[PDB]
Structure 1
Amino acid sequence: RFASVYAWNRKRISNCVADYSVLYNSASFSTFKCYGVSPTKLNDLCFTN
């Protein structure tokens, strides 16, 4: 079950190593916009939280 958009869920992702290529290389997503960040270099960048 996902959230109702009026009550949109939030989860903190932290203290971990990502691989956004697992997401972006998948064909099932119909839309994958990014703002201030590029979906490829997203996998080279790193974040506080």
Structure 2
Amino acid sequence: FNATRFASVYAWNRKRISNCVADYSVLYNLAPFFTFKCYGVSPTKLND
């Protein structure tokens, strides 16, 4: 999320996340993240 480098919407960058403990509060707590829309899952339940 905090990487300085973001690819174009074509040849879009893709990163696989495996074998870790996530904490989504570090994401939606950020001020700039004005838009946070989820399909099939809710923001509050991501950590559970």
TM-score of the superposed pair, with normalisation by structure 1: 0.80
Q: For 2:47 and 2:14, how far apart are their aligned partners in 1?
A: 22
Select the structure with the greater relative contact order (CA < 8 A; seq sep ≥ 6). Answer: 1
Which aligned segments of 4 or more residues in structure 1 are displaced greater than 3 angstroms?
none
Question: 1:16-36 deviations in whole A, cap 9, x for unaligned?
Answer: 000001111221112110110
Percent identity, aligned pairs only, is 93
TM-score of the superposed pair, with normalisation by structure 2: 0.81
Q: Which runs of 5+ in 2 are unaligned?
A: none
Q: Which runs of 5+ in 1 are unaligned?
A: 45-49
RMSD: 0.9
Task: Kindly indicate which of the two structures has a greater share of residues assigned to helix.
Answer: 1
Question: 1:1-49 deviations in whole A, cap 9, x for unaligned?
Answer: 21011110100001000000111122111211011000110111xxxxx
